[PDB]
From Swiss-Prot:
GO cellular component: cytoplasm
GO biological process: carbohydrate metabolic process
GO molecular function list: 4-alpha-glucanotransferase activity
Gene: malQ
Protein name per the record: 4-alpha-glucanotransferase
Length: 500
């Protein structure tokens, strides 16, 4: 794809400021788009937007199609009398998921009750039309969530066998018995997609493109795995027989056992890769570009026997990446995908990526732990510049946080390297800006930075810390924290590096 020389910001919607404990698809989101526009940014990047479970990770969703109900702006609903919003006492600067779970779900349920009572014919009609258009994934998602609620939150493969194995009779009975719960979940979806569609329209009016994100592998406890057992390696009881992960290395002698179910690629191929085509079709209704986590998995993946508690017993298995993207290209006439290609990749992975002109990534926080050969250093980037450079992603600490724990060698080499590129700094809080400037001076067509770096925040603002059991995905902006001055500084930088 042809990427213009520009810049953007990374900010998950939950991090947006606003009342009621979590960022939503409303005015604050529009304020951010306006801020981005004033700053000269042309891209807004978010993390996966599906519904979340224990851990609150957007990369482990109950569905590969559904939208996150927590992102629904409840104000438009209250403004119609559908519900009476109450603040239990949400904190500032962070999402308290426990409190959000206990409070927002009931608020959404109360709003649905109010809706069925006061909703106008136009609204009732639109909601019905939506349920009908999206049935191909919505029926399964809505019933999945209704059954989960009726079975104490248990994962689908722990529900009674008739429901678990989707016996027609039992399934139809459950759907009737849970008609109201099913409708409610469909209601949260109609709202999510309606609000996201309006926000996407606002971004487009401001000349902004949205970069979406999705994990290559779906979650074990999700609607699509339950509904399409034939697409994954499961045993008759719904248990994965093999799981995703990565081989042991110089860090984890045990490697990483992610646990995600793996695709029966042969079955998918015979079906014209329908699952993926559909997944991308839906994603393209929300985003202009979509990144796919662990992109190398389309070339080959580390397959771990589910019985193994670690990733030591795995083996590399080839996937039909070539054939899948040939299909994606013919169906969508192009491939609007960004490849997450960090870590150790192979010449075949790089080959697949370039073959379809997919831009890869570069993370500046990883460029100074060795020498001038480090692929993350700007002078080593491809001359075609089809790559996206970040100071750090959602999985990294904020740049100031990173700097404070960096090795003496790292800190010294960074300063010297910056000096070579005509960049300097005085206080440590300036490092985030110095690195953002380095990225903008680079040949990378796109430079995307987390808002926390624009604010020069410390480790307390880190989005996610792989391996840490708590405090993840919780950071939030404060109202007005992003000032016109932050915007003007970004714009001046973009102008000087010709990214406007």
């Amino acid at each position: 794809m042809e990427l213009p020389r520009a810049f953007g910001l990374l900010l998950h919607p939950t991090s947006l400021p606003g009342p009621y404990g979590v960022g939503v698809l409303g005015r604050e989101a529009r304020d951010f788009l306006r801020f981005l526009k004033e700053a000269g940014g042309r891209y807004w990047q978010v993390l996966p937007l599906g519904p979340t479970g224990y851990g609150d990770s957007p990369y482990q969703s109950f569905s590969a199609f559904a939208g996150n109900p927590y992102l629904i702006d409840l104000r438009p609903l209250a403004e119609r009398g559908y519900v009476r919003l109450e603040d239990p006492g949400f904190p500032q600067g962070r999402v308290d998921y426990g409190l959000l779970y206990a409070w927002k779900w009931p608020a959404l349920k109360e709003a649905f009750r109010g809706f069925k009572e006061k909703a106008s014919p136009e609204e009732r009609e639109a909601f019905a039309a939506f349920r009908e258009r999206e049935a191909w994934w919505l029926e399964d998602y809505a019933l999945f969530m209704a059954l989960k609620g009726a079975h104490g939150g248990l994962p689908w493969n722990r529900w009674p066998l008739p429901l678990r194995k989707r016996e027609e009779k039992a399934l139809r009975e459950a759907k009737s018995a849970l008609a109201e719960e099913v409708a409610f979940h469909a209601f949260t979806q109609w709202l999510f997609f309606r609000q996201w569609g309006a926000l996407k329209a606002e971004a487009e009016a401001l000349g902004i493109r949205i970069i979406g994100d999705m994990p290559i592998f779906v979650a074990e406890d999700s609607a699509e795995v339950w509904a399409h057992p034939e697409w994954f390696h499961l045993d008759e009881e719904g248990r994965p027989t093999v799981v995703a992960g990565v081989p042991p290395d110089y860090f984890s002698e045990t490697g990483q056992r992610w646990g995600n179910p793996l695709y029966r690629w042969d079955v998918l191929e015979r079906e014209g890769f329908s699952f993926w085509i559909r997944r991308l079709e839906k994603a393209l209704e929300l985003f202009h570009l979509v990144r796919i986590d662990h992109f190398r998995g389309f070339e080959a993946y580390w397959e771990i026997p589910a019985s193994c508690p670690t990733a030591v017993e795995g083996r590399w298995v080839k996937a039909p990446g070539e054939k899948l993207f040939q299909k994606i290209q013919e169906v969508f006439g192009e491939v609007p995908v960004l490849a997450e290609d960090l870590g150790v990749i192979t010449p075949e992975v790089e080959a697949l990526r370039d073959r379809f002109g997919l831009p890869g990534m570069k993370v500046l926080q990883f460029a100074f732990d060795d020498g001038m050969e480090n692929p993350f250093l700007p002078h080593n980037y491809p001359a075609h510049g089809r790559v996206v450079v970040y100071t750090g992603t959602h999985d990294n600490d904020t740049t100031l946080g990173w700097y404070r724990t960096a090795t003496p060698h790292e800190k010294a080499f960074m300063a010297r390297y910056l000096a070579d590129w005509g960049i300097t700094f005085r206080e440590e809080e300036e490092v985030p800006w110095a690195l953002m400037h380095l990225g903008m001076k680079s040949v990378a067509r796109l430079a995307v930075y987390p808002v926390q770096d624009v604010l020069a925040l410390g480790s307390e603002a880190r989005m996610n810390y792989p391996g840490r059991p708590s405090g993840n995905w919780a950071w939030r902006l404060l109202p007005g924290e992003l000032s016109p001055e932050h915007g003007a500084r970004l714009r001046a930088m973009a102008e000087a590096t010709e990214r406007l």
